[PDB]
Design a protein around this motif. Structure first.
Motif: not given
Length: 230
Positions: A178-180, A199-204, A212-213, A219-220
């Motif tokens: 994720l970082h990269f 990305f939706c799914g990552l936040w979801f 991680i977030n 990124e946001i």
């Protein structure tokens, strides 16, 4: 006359045919190919030395594009040839620079690393502690009885002090995935529809996550885009 020219051509020809093969019929486990091509990029470093006009000018086309070459090799071995999570180290380091193409290799591998994070989430973490406690209570006739406990406990503590290792693995290699892949997004075009949903799914699911977030919080902040429609 080879002033960088033939050496770069030979490694290029090697990768050029190979990435067709990587998308062929049955490529269950090409770990070997990954590594052989990796070595061509890592060791044929003098690929550019003599310096001689046309030789230098190859940049005005692509030249080596090592990160792309490296990650294509990384991508075709995925699944049993992935070599689980250790590979994240080899897939790392060659991070080059922001460029016209590249953001897409991060997402392909990044997505795979997440798929692996899910194909990990099968470990018996429910009944691990459950059975430990079961034995603990049951640690009677076979343990409380007397010296039996001393041997049972020795085994229990060693069995007990294990699971958090997988937690860290999931919370570590995925940090890097994720970082990269998040950081590369920047120039979001062409392949964005599929990134937006990702990305939706990552936040979801990964809504609450201070490590991680954290990469996503940044990124946001680094992508104050005026798109974000769907």
């Amino acid at each position: 006359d080879d002033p960088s020219v033939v050496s770069q051509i030979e490694k290029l020809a090697s990768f050029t045919s190979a990435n067709a093969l990587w998308e062929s019929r049955e490529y269950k486990a090409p770990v070997m190919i990954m590594r052989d091509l990796l070595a061509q990029n890592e060791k044929n470093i003098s690929e550019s030395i003599l310096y001689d006009d046309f030789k230098l000018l190859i940049n005005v086309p692509m030249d080596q594009i090592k990160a792309r070459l490296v990650k294509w090799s990384s991508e075709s071995r995925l699944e049993p040839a992935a070599a689980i999570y250790e590979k994240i180290i080899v897939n790392w380091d060659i991070n080059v620079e922001d460029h016209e193409s590249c953001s897409d290799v991060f997402y392909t591998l990044g997505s795979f690393l997440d798929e692996q994070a899910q194909k990990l989430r099968s470990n018996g973490e429910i009944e691990d502690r459950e059975h430990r406690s079961y034995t603990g209570k049951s640690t009677l006739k076979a343990l409380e009885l007397i010296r039996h406990y001393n041997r049972v406990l020795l085994q229990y503590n060693r069995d007990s002090e294990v699971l958090k290792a997988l937690l860290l693995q999931k919370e570590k290699f995925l940090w890097h995935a994720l970082h990269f892949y998040l950081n590369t997004l920047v120039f979001s075009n062409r392949y964005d529809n599929d990134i937006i949903d990702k990305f939706c799914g990552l936040w979801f699911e990964n809504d609450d996550n201070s490590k991680i977030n954290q990469l996503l919080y940044k990124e946001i902040g680094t992508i104050p885009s005026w798109k974000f429609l769907p």
